[PDB]
Amino acid sequence: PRWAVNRPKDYETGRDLHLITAKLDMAIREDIMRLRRIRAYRGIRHELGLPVRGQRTRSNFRRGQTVGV
Amino acid sequence: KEFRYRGYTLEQLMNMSLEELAKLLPARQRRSLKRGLTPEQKKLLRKIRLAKKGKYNKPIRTHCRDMIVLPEMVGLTIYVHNGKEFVPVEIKPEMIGHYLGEFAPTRKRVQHGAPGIGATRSSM
Amino acid sequence: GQKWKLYIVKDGKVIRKNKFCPRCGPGVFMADHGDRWACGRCGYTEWKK
Amino acid sequence: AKPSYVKFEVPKELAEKALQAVEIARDTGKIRKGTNETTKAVERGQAKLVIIAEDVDPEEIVAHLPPLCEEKEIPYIYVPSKKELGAAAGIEVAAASVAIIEPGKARDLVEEIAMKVRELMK
Amino acid sequence: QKARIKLASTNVRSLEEVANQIKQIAERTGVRMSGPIPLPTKRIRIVTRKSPDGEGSATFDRWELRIHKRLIDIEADERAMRQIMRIRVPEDVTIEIELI
Amino acid sequence: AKADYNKRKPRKFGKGARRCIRCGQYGPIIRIHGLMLCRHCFREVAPKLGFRKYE
RNA sequence: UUAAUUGGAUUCAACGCCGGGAACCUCACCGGGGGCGACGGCAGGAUGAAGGCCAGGCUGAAGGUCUUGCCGGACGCGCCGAG
Ligand SMILES: [Mg+2]
Ligand SMILES: [Mg+2]
Ligand SMILES: [Mg+2]
Ligand SMILES: [Mg+2]
Ligand SMILES: [Zn+2]
């Protein structure tokens, strides 16, 4: 069925496709690069390495070292 | 290297009815178009079409951060309010289907300073 | 000041230059846009000659 | 209208029936001042007693009622002064035409003076 | 040919008085009346925070309102129908009459 | 018209569509069984309405 | 940190607490645009006060204001008290 593939309604050809290995990786990379080129909000979030889907960042998502006073 | 959105060129997208175009956008945009445009978006679209006709040689500034980018808007420059100022946005073909507000950030990037008094248990 | 003129009135004959609204009675006067009858209150898109 | 317009003389009875018959009609009638407002009233026949005082210069907004007098019945009299014309019926200002429509118990004298004006000059 | 009567009140004693009056009216005439059936009580419970501000330990009030109900069936006879039609209920009792 | 610059919009949902009928506050409104009262006002008028604290 | 990231509460007895799960409203914060002075009196006002509008500019959008002229008739924040 057309609803079971991992890339339906392709952005370029408009068909329903299924990708594996390297082609899948480069397709995802191309999607993120397209977002970055137009300077969209999600593109900036991808660039800065920050959460993209609207999470809060004050408490969790901490990855670093403690800063002293 | 040409631009195609679902296998269609930009010219083909230009000569499409609004209902026909909605079948290519994602679900959210299709629902938003199916429910019609708000009056403010109607005024903005009228201004855009007037500018395309060769009239209205002035900057286009708007508050409508929730307007969906359409193929007939490609090539113009629009100033979207971000809370305190209008920032210029140059519409590219790959912007079709996105809200205007996605290109006008509202918050300034954070650069942290030295932690103050009370930031740790021992500093209080 | 005073704005009551442009109606051709002579020694014994009174006739108005600006017509009245057909929706209303006489006495009401339209503007002098020349492109159309502004009508003052209702408006008409007639392209007055 | 205006003193610099010789229509006829100044009969005393005209003033008697045009001034001293509106105070007794002010409390039992309606009043509409203003030349522009009364112009629509006289053109449509809304007014009943047109008392035109001679205080309006030039003969620009006054050159409408005499040219229109022959078009309707327009029972009209003339007033010598304007300062107390508003006091007789209206407010403490200078009035030019106080139109009273359907006044109470002010019929006999008004009708007599109207007939006098009809047989005087029209 | 039967009438159904529904009673509801927040005071139990008044409900009993009205029911007893109807029962006596039915007794003083030859007419069969199905006894007053007690229906389940309505309880309205509302729980609210006590303090106006938000400081201190949290404590709660539990307010409750109770509504009692009764059901009576009686056959439509005009000699007894007028008598129950002329009885006067207290202001805190609701009565409804219908013919089935 | 200048009076149009003071009238509010007629909202039908949201926190701005309900006010206490006794004090006019927005926010903590008790909507149970058609009551329109703040949690503050309900405590001091509950006995008058017939409520009691049985337990 | 920011244009603002509204404010109260700091041991038990502050920190899923202010019934606080805020897209608009709530809202108190930030950028911008409009509106409001019963009642006394002062300039002023039918030779018309105060107020309102078809179209088109300014504008995010707006008879808000301006251009263009049509409206209606007794009060009057341009001024001082007071509210
Ligand atoms: Mg805080
Ligand atoms: Mg909560
Ligand atoms: Mg929320
Ligand atoms: Mg909000
Ligand atoms: Zn309340």
UniProtKB/Swiss-Prot annotation, chain A:
Coiled-coil parts of chain? none
Identify its protein family. Belongs to the universal ribosomal protein uS13 family.
Q: What does this protein do?
A: Located at the top of the head of the 30S subunit, it contacts several helices of the 16S rRNA. In the 70S ribosome it contacts the 23S rRNA (bridge B1a) and protein L5 of the 50S subunit (bridge B1b), connecting the 2 subunits; these bridges are implicated in subunit movement.
Oligomer and partners: Part of the 30S ribosomal subunit. Forms a loose heterodimer with protein S19. Forms two bridges to the 50S subunit in the 70S ribosome.
Q: What is this protein called?
A: Small ribosomal subunit protein uS13
Q: What is the lineage of its organism?
A: Archaea, Methanobacteriati, Methanobacteriota, Thermococci, Thermococcales
| Gene that this polypeptide is encoded by | rps13
- Whole-protein coverage range: 75 to 143 of 148
Curated annotation (Swiss-Prot), chain B:
Per UniProt, the keywords (alphabetical) are: Ribonucleoprotein, Ribosomal protein, RNA-binding, rRNA-binding
Function, as annotated, reads: Protein S19 forms a complex with S13 that binds strongly to the 16S ribosomal RNA.
GO process terms (BP): ribosomal small subunit assembly; translation
Q: What PROSITE patterns does the record point to?
A: RIBOSOMAL_S19 (PS00323)
**Where is the secretion signal located?**
none
The name on file for this protein is Small ribosomal subunit protein uS19
Top-level lineage group: Archaea
Pfam families found in the cross-reference section: Ribosomal_S19
Q: Name one GO cellular component term.
A: cytosolic small ribosomal subunit
Q: Which family does it belong to?
A: Belongs to the universal ribosomal protein uS19 family.
Entry's Gene Ontology molecular function annotations: rRNA binding; structural constituent of ribosome
Swiss-Prot record, chain D:
Q: Which PROSITE patterns match?
A: RIBOSOMAL_L7AE (PS01082)
Identify one Gene Ontology CC term for this UniProt entry.
Answer: ribosome
Instruction: Tell me yes or no: is Ubl conjugation among this UniProt entry's keywords.
Output: no
Recorded superkingdom: Archaea
Pfam families reported for this sequence: Ribosomal_L7Ae
Annotated GO molecular function terms are: ribonuclease P activity; rRNA binding; structural constituent of ribosome
* Cell compartment(s), UniProt: Cytoplasm
Kindly give the NCBIfam families that the UniProt entry links to this protein.
eL8_ribo (TIGR03677)
Q: What does this protein do?
A: Multifunctional RNA-binding protein that recognizes the K-turn motif in ribosomal RNA, the RNA component of RNase P, box H/ACA, box C/D and box C'/D' sRNAs.
Q: How does it assemble?
A: Part of the 50S ribosomal subunit. Probably part of the RNase P complex.
* Name used for this protein in its record: Large ribosomal subunit protein eL8
Q: Which organism is it from?
A: Pyrococcus abyssi (strain GE5 / Orsay)
What gene is this protein translated from?
A: rpl7ae
UniProtKB/Swiss-Prot annotation, chain E:
Q: Which domain of life is it from?
A: Archaea
The answer to keyword Ribosomal protein applying to this record is yes
What keywords sit in the KW lines?
Answer: Ribonucleoprotein, Ribosomal protein
Instruction: Name a Pfam family for this protein.
Output: Ribosomal_S10
A GO BP term here is: translation
Family assignment? Answer: Belongs to the universal ribosomal protein uS10 family.
Q: What does this protein do?
A: Involved in the binding of tRNA to the ribosomes.
Q: What HAMAP family does the database record attribute to this sequence? A: Ribosomal_uS10
How the protein assembles, per its UniProt entry? Part of the 30S ribosomal subunit.
This protein is called what? Answer: Small ribosomal subunit protein uS10
* Native source organism of the sequence: Pyrococcus abyssi (strain GE5 / Orsay)
Q: Which gene encodes it?
A: rps10
